[PDB]
């Protein structure tokens, strides 16, 4: 029932097959091919000039291929956003994921993209977090205080922010 949602995104797991993803997402919401290659892209509600969405990448084009990549925008709200400009400025390239989360707040971030190029191995994992100040997240409209923190192998490689205070 319904469009792609955060609950569906959370239920979908790394390692699931294409058909398991469609079982949960609802194939009426999803597409493959075109600009998405062999990935599966699933639309949520209208938001801005597009939609909230998820994109799932797989270990190969095969039917038995497993989810090795999950990306989403506007499906997940941060659970307790407490990021501030000061906390963003406390984050340093070279920090581990644990150090970054302790700095920005354990409830400030959602996972924008997460990819395991050696799935099921975690070697080479890349991770982008979208992190938000107390009122920065919106599931429909323009963000009002957000940051992108990205990692490879669990080490922060860069940070950018927009409109934090």
């Amino acid at each position: 029932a319904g469009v792609m949602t955060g609950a569906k995104f959370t239920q979908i797991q790394f390692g699931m097959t294409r058909q398991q993803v469609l079982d949960i997402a609802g194939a009426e919401n999803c597409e493959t091919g075109g600009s998405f290659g062999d990935s599966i892209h699933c639309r949520g509600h209208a938001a801005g000039d597009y939609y909230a969405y998820a994109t799932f990448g797989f270990t190969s084009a095969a039917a038995d291929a497993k989810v090795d990549s999950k990306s989403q925008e506007k499906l997940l709200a941060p659970s307790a956003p407490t990021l501030t400009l000061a906390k963003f400025n406390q984050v340093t390239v070279g920090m581990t994921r644990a150090q970054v989360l302790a700095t920005v707040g354990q409830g400030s971030c959602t996972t924008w993209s997460e990819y395991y190029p050696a799935y099921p191995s975690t070697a080479g994992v890349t991770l982008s977090l979208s992190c938000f100040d107390v009122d920065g997240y919106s599931s429909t409209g323009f963000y009002r205080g957000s940051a992108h923190l990205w990692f490879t192998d669990g080490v922060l490689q860069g940070k950018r922010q927009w409109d934090l205070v």
Binding site: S35, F36, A46, D49, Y50, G141, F142, R144, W162
Partner: protein
């Protein structure tokens, strides 16, 4: 007609916001104008200008759309449904243009802006087309702040309608480039709830929406009505509250008002 003006004024009053409309009917070069010389934040409707600037450049470099552009994590900004697939890889300028125009991909937009030299270079392209009003000042995502009174990243409905006419129907671009722009805009993945929702289903529309802060909700379109010469329609809408929700239906309502009888 004064009737159309009153209907648009009433729609604006009922909506609580500020509405800008410019329609050009190319059958007789007539126009319907409402706040058409006021500035409005363009938001993603500016992706048309950036794609057109690259198309114009391609008239002097005909393989340009096949040139590859690297996508890196540092490039990512929100609304990146296509570019995120290609992080640590590349996309062609054609793929970036299509992604900006059809998925409103903001990373693609920033690559188009950067390719031509930055926001001031997109503005210079507008000037070369005779558009003295358009100004692109920022990249994505900050070009969407849409703060009332801020002229950055704004244009007027009159200026944008004339420019869109020149690009999609006139001679601002070469014939093949104009056809490519129209092909891309006919393939946008949204727009159905904006101008198009106010038009008969049989009409063919190439459009680009925009959305931003202050509930800004925009759409620009080239329209081929059944058995009629094409129209150009620009509808811009913005609201007083920073967190206002989008009102795509207001654009549909404006489109219905100004095309009633065609």
């Amino acid at each position: 007609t004064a009737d159309v003006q009153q209907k648009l004024a009433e729609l604006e009053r009922q909506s609580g916001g500020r509405l800008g409309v410019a329609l050009i009917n190319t059958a007789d070069n007539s126009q319907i104008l409402y706040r058409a010389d006021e500035r409005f934040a363009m938001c993603s409707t500016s992706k048309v200008m950036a794609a057109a600037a690259v198309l114009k450049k391609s008239e002097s470099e005909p393989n340009l759309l096949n040139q590859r552009v690297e996508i890196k994590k540092s490039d990512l900004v929100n609304y990146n449904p296509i570019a995120e697939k290609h992080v640590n890889g590349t996309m062609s300028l054609a793929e970036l243009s299509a992604a900006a125009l059809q998925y409103s991909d903001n990373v693609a937009m920033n690559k188009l802006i950067a390719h031509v030299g930055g926001p001031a270079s997109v503005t210079a392209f507008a000037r070369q087309l005779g558009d003295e009003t358009f100004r692109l000042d920022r990249t994505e995502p900050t070009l969407n702040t849409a703060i009332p009174g801020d002229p950055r990243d704004t244009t007027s409905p009159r200026a944008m309608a004339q420019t869109l006419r020149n690009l999609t129907l006139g001679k601002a671009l070469g014939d093949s480039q104009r056809a490519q722009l129209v092909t891309w805009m006919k393939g946008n993945t949204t727009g159905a709830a904006s101008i198009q929702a106010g038009l008969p289903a049989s009409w063919v529309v190439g459009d680009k929406t925009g959305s931003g802060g202050y509930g800004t909700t925009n759409d620009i379109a080239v329209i081929w009505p059944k058995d009629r010469a094409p129209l150009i329609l620009v509808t811009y809408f913005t609201q007083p509250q920073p967190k206002a929700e989008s009102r795509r239906d207001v654009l549909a309502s404006a489109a219905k008002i100004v095309t009633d009888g065609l």
